[PDB]
Amino acid sequence: RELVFKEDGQEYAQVIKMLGNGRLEAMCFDGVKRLCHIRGKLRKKVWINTSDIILVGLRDYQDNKADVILKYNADEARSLKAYGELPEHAKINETDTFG
Amino acid sequence: GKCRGLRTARKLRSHRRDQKWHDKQYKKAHLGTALKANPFGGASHAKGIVLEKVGVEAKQPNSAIRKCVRVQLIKNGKKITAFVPNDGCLNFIEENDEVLVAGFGRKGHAVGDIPGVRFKVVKVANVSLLALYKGKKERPR
Amino acid sequence: HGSLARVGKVRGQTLKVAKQEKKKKRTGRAKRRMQYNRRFVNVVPTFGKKKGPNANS
Amino acid sequence: PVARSWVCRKTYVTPRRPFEKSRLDQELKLIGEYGLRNKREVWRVKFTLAKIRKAARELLTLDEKDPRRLFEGNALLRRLVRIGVLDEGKMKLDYILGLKIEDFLERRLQTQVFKLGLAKSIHHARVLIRQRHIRVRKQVVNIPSFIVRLDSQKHIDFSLRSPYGGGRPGRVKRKNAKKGQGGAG
Amino acid sequence: KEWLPVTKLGRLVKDMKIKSLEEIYLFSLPIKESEIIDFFLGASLKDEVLKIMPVQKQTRAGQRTRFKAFVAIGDYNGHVGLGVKCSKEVATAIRGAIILAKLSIVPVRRGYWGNKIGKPHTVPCKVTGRCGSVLVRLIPAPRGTGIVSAPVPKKLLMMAGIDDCYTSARGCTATLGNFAKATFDAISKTYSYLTPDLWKETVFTKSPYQEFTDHLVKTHT
RNA sequence: CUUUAAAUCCUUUAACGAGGAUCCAUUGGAGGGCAAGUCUGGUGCCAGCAGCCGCGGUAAUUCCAGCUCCAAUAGCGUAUA
């Protein structure tokens, strides 16, 4: 509904391996692998898929854990990409809902 | 009882001793394995150096994470995992600092929704966490 | 916002009010005397459910 | 090897239930009516009454015409009639068990000063005793928990070194008198 | 607000021919009007609610909850009773439990511990009552001991007039209804026990139904 | 002054020594177990509380602060045999 951007302690990541036990692996836009955690509103109200644009929170004393906040589906994700936040090597690969 | 003879005392004593050893609390309280596996070594409190901070998660009923530190003791060399109790008291602790850990409430048992943690932090840098949390004393600079 | 699991967030963003300067409270024998008086000789015969000491319904 | 005693004991027993209702009600009633300070005093009186009752019970489980029973039972009975909680018409071993906490708390020095007729209230009686105003047989008492005897009840009066029983006045009388002398001079 | 007795016992009590419920207990007649006892025992019959326990029944459209009330009744110098009633509402269940408790009260007897001086204060012997898995034992105590019990049998023993008792319970005492019914059956057994205080040959006096039948045939059909 | 090898401590005793008698009593709680607010403001499954049931999802009786109340009282709470 609204375009909210990243802040201090938050960034964007791409889901690489979709696991169980309410956690997943996401590749952050800084160049490090992290074990993210599914938020309490993100278990069943929304469904997180692979290769999607998500909001990932930083951890200030350990640097191998994270947690996920939001999810951008198609148009706000491509509008955020048009603004410029990521290295251009990463590929969207047309992330949206299929038919 | 079953033996009701006038000269039946050795059998009753041996049966009571065998059924006493065949128990739970007497079994942990009389072997050396249950006290040897204890990282405190039969002690109420222990000291050690904090290496790192870990955010351990809660159980399935409730959704939060628990701020925790990992302690390597000096009396035996074992590595334990102790919870920082109050709100915002993790910021009073940094790496390579000594703390005084204690039990967490149920005598070597995970209490509440925190899995795999049986200890808590009482004092940090030779001053209590309650005095720092209530704003009575200050960390020595 | 900042981060989700910030250490000491709520106590850090809590509003700060000050204590109110009040009269001191009696302690010792006179505290028990006041409690006995207020609980046993200032009571009126009532019916139903007895009201609590802190009832503010 | 030092020459000490190392002999001491507790004078009270805490109750089993920490948060009850009716027990706290009669404890508060006893404290407010007898002007006590805390629950430790009424628990102490309850403990010594329980010890006396326990001794009376274990002597009452015994048989008659036993000389040690007759001896220390008569010792207990003469102690209980000389302390003021028993009468001569009830000099029997079973009548010890019919005693109450009111009988032990009525021989306290505070309520004896209050009922003797020289104190306004029982808290005023405790203040009067604590500030060294009375004496019991040519000897002042600084404490309210002085359990009097039957033969020493008629000797309680004001102390000689007190402004109430005739003596030197206190400090606010002398200070106000000196202020009046300064204002008049 | 008037008394219209449907039984000849209630009419006979209302006609001032029965002095007290002593002979009613002696002849072991069932009491089916709860206000006969309320006439005999009036303002000296206090009560309070032990526990309101909700029970539910599963249907197609959810659960139909119902409230069950436990109340203790009795004068502090003798008789004591207990009643159980369940209904839809709380107040209706409580008033039905009050009527059912006052309908069925039993007399208790008191004895001595050793010497027979003064008034009786304790349970005369060792009685036991059992219902469900709960066992309640009543043991005599010396004078001035008090009631050493759980709070529910303690309040039942104080409302029954017994001043001194030692107790020992076994079973699932967390269920209040079974515990209360067990101590009620324990204290109700004080007259079914035979003691050598009463071994003389009793005389069978005439029943009120035989004694006042000429009054009854005139007062009712 | 007494005590004491000589002192100190206690007791005795003259001169001073309290009105909000500022000469100012704390420790744990307030859903049940278990005595005691369906109070107010803030965060909003976050922070955290919770020995056990469980409490927090943008109207919290349980979190964080103020008021009020409750248990013991120069004492109270916590961890281990």
Q: What is the DSSP string of chain A?
A: -------TTEEEEEEEE--STTEEEEEETTS-EEEEE--TTSSSSS---SS-EEEEE--SS-SSB-EEEEEE-SHHHHHHHHH--S-TTS-----S---
Asked if strand F contacts C6 at the CB level, meaning under 7 A, the answer is yes
* DSSP assignment letter at D89: G
- Among E179, E195, E186, E134, which residue's Cα sits nearest to residue E160? E186
B27 is written with which tokens?
């079994």
Tally the residues of chain B. Answer: 141
Cβ E188 vs Cβ E157: under 8 Å: no
Q: Is B91 touching A (CB cutoff 8 A)?
A: no
Structural domain spans, chain A? 1-99
> Partners for C (CB, 8 Å, 3+ pairs)?
A, B, D
Cβ D77 vs Cβ D86: under 8 Å: yes
Q: Mark out the alpha helices in chain B (DSSP H runs).
A: 10-21, 25-28, 33-36, 129-133
* DSSP assignment letter at E128: E
State the residue range of the domain holding E87. 8-106
E32 is written with which tokens?
């089916």
Cβ E147 vs Cβ E154: under 8 Å: yes
Cβ B27 vs Cβ B33: under 8 Å: no
Asked if strand F contacts C11 at the CB level, meaning under 7 A, the answer is yes
Method: cryo-EM
- Among B135, B89, B87, B67, which residue's Cα sits nearest to residue C10? B87
Integer Cα distance of D48 and D54 in angstroms: 10
Q: Is A62 touching B (CB cutoff 8 A)?
A: yes
Q: What is the nearest CA distance from B35 to chain C, expressed in angstroms? A: 36
D18 is written with which tokens?
């920490």
Integer Cα distance of A35 and A52 in angstroms: 16
Cβ B69 vs Cβ B92: under 8 Å: no
∠ CA E121-E122-E127 to the nearest 5 degrees? Answer: 155
- Count the Cβ atoms, other than its own, within 10 Å of residue B37: 10
Q: Is C28 touching A (CB cutoff 8 A)?
A: no
Identity of residue E94: I
Burial class (CB in 10 A: 0-12, 13-18, 19+), A37: buried
Integer Cα distance of C18 and C30 in angstroms: 29
CB pairs under 8 A between A and B: 13
Give the strand pairing for E147-148 and E165-170.
Answer: parallel
D92: closest chain E residue by CA: E117
End-to-end CA distance of chain E: give it in Å, rounded. 24
Chain C residues with beta carbon closer than 8 angstroms to that of A39 = 4
D105 is written with which tokens?
């708390």
Q: Across the interface, do D37 and C33 touch by the CB < 8 Å criterion?
A: no
Cβ E159 vs Cβ E183: under 8 Å: no
Find all residues with CB under 8 Å of A59, minimum gap 6, and list them: A65, A66, A67, B55, C3, C5
Integer Cα distance of E97 and A16 in angstroms: 68
- Count the Cβ atoms, other than its own, within 10 Å of residue D183: 7
Q: Across the interface, do C5 and A69 touch by the CB < 8 Å criterion?
A: no
Give the strand pairing for B127-128 and E127-131.
Answer: unpaired
Burial A61-88 (b: 16+ CB within 10 A, else e): beeebbbbbebbeeebbbebbeeeeeee
Q: What is the DSSP string of A45-62?
A: SS---SS-EEEEE--SS-
- Chain B contact probe: residue of C3, C4, C6, C7 with most B CBs at under 10 A: C7
D27: closest chain C residue by CA: C36
Q: Is D32 touching C (CB cutoff 8 A)?
A: yes
D58 is written with which tokens?
């274990």
D155 is written with which tokens?
């000797």
Q: Is E212 helix (H, G, I), strand (E, B) or coil?
A: coil
How many domains does the structure of chain B reveal?
1
Pick left, alpha or beta for residue D4 (phi over 0 → left; psi -120 to 50 → alpha; otherwise beta).
beta
D15 is written with which tokens?
């109750």
Using CA atoms in the order E91, E94, E95, E99, what is the torsion angle rounded to 10 degrees? Answer: 170
Find all residues with CB under 8 Å of D110, minimum gap 6, and list them: D34, D35, D122, D125, D126, D129, D144, D145
Integer Cα distance of E132 and E172 in angstroms: 9
From C3, C5, C7, residue closest to A10, measured CB to CB: C3
Integer Cα distance of E184 and E108 in angstroms: 10
- C-alpha to C-alpha distances, D120 to D125, D173, E117, E121, nearest whole angstrom: 7, 21, 42, 40
Burial C18-56 (b: 16+ CB within 10 A, else e): eeeeeeeeeeebeebbeebeeeeeeeeeeeeeeeeeeee
Cβ D112 vs Cβ D153: under 8 Å: yes
Asked if strand F contacts C15 at the CB level, meaning under 7 A, the answer is yes
CATH number at residue E55: 3.30.160.20
- Among B66, D148, E201, which residue's Cα sits nearest to residue C7? B66
Pick left, alpha or beta for residue E154 (phi over 0 → left; psi -120 to 50 → alpha; otherwise beta).
alpha
Cβ B93 vs Cβ B133: under 8 Å: no
Integer Cα distance of B121 and B68 in angstroms: 9
